[PDB]
Symmetry: C3
Subunit: 227 residues, 3 copies
Amino acid sequence: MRIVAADTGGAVLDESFQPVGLIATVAVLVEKPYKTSKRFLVKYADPYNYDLSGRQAIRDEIELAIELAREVSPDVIHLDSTLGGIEVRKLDESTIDALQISDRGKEIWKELSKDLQPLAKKFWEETGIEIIAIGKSSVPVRIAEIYAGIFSVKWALDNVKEKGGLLVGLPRYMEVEIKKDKIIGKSLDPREGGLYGEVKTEVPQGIKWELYPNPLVRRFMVFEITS
Amino acid sequence: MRIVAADTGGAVLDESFQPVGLIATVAVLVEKPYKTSKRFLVKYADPYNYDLSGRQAIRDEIELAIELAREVSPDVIHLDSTLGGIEVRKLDESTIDALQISDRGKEIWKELSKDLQPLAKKFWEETGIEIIAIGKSSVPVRIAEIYAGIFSVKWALDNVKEKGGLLVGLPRYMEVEIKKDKIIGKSLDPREGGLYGEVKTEVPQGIKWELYPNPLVRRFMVFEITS
Amino acid sequence: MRIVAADTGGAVLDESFQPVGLIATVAVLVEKPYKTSKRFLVKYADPYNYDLSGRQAIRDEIELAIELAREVSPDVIHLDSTLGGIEVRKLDESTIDALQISDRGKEIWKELSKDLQPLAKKFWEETGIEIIAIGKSSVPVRIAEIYAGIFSVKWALDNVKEKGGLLVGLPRYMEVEIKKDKIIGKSLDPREGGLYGEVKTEVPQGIKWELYPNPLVRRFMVFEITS
Ligand SMILES: [Mg+2]
Ligand SMILES: [Mg+2]
Ligand SMILES: [Mg+2]
């Protein structure tokens, strides 16, 4: 199978570890053995002006996934919404209320439906490719998320000399290593079977960084950097 | 404590990783230090003709557990249904509706009750041994599950030359190693404290195998083999 | 951030692994990098005369947290109740029923409210320090819990020659190592990012101990000791 997926991750935090906004939306192509991606797109948000409700993220995600899928012709697109793998082109109001999910989950999706259902329907008509609301069940979605963490660290590297110091909340239970002009991201959960990513990027001189637990959100790490 | 438990696991998958049917039901005897089993029974299903609803599995499980328990006289039997450890001989309709579980969980159990409650009651009258619906809380159930994964890999080894190629979905977050005429199965979750199993079986020549993440089901691995 | 947190853990078990009562309540001060504590208080319960409902634990916890906080002046106290981080001084009845939790969760808290809400309100008036019901989201709460496990092993060491043999159920997925007059406790979950604790205490001669899975409670270990 060849799968395109997308997710958003990486948060700028304040000094009390409260999220200000998110940093990176990433679309990935994933193929066997489904542990990493060698083909991906990133869109950087403005974390100092972000919508933390989930709406902005999923819209950026589905658009970036479609952008990558138009090029690499995957068998399917995985979207990060955990709805049991239903096709997004089928998500009209009546289908959404029938879903076995939360009522505010239904709130958000009945609002998203107006744009996303026609979008997925048109993309399917054009390409035959489904966009499925699989969410946390998807390994390609998790690989996208790990890359969003990696690209959030790239963003921190690229912005810390202007900003002085940054606190970046990473996606759940992942670490990064910074080597000579390379960031490697790895899941911390061995149950996931060895998921990772790598981005080549220039590491500036005159910086120091550290990775440690977010004390307010168990199993999430913080990347702290100063110049 | 000496505990008999049972579970079913291992799925034949198609090329899109969709489950066709399950492969192995295993009953284990587990004693201190509760990390593995050295005494077990296996029943192989026909995965190309299986009931994926859960009904077939739990019936095969309770029968195989009783078969092993009749020999090894455990203190208790653990059944893989997560109902808080209630004795199955007590599971009449009124008790089942009183349970703090899903209504389709109640659906399945009110149907199973007609056979399983009298079965557990009779076994208890004969032996004093309870059959408890403990499910995911039980370590012996997880050890049975790991052995079902192992025996599913044995089944793949034994059938791949006739079948040409096989995709086996393993139970959640476990790996296998194939050594000289031995399969070793291990949990991937260090939180479980080092659970494992081993089955001695002939490894055929002229095969190649690989273990990798199921991209559609996070934290589940696939064993792929060709001849 | 400087955080005080508390939790209770460690259970005396009978020979069928059933809990008799809990052993240690611990308050910790946690600072960057939020992996351990070097400043803590312990209160030992009488496990052979304990209230397993949760009431005794949370009362001992909030009092011990306040006792430590009065000395070390943390920015905040984390209490082990998972209510989304609401301030305990705000937990009147109407707020509790408004919470998005279980109805027996509301049962317990509407009873606790009569003492704990005025207590938290007074402490805040005195110090400006909030007591927040953050629960499982808190890393400092987990570090307190790991120390409760460690101190429960100290309690077992200190009592095994009078008791002959003890079975101690540890907090979820943690291990201990016993070195020369030191107990080291570590989380078994690498997703938590390397949480640990250490207590210096005399290890008696003429004992043997073992750590292994609790077969009735997956991902929880037992510390067994005899003299
Ligand atoms: Mg997401
Ligand atoms: Mg099962
Ligand atoms: Mg607690």
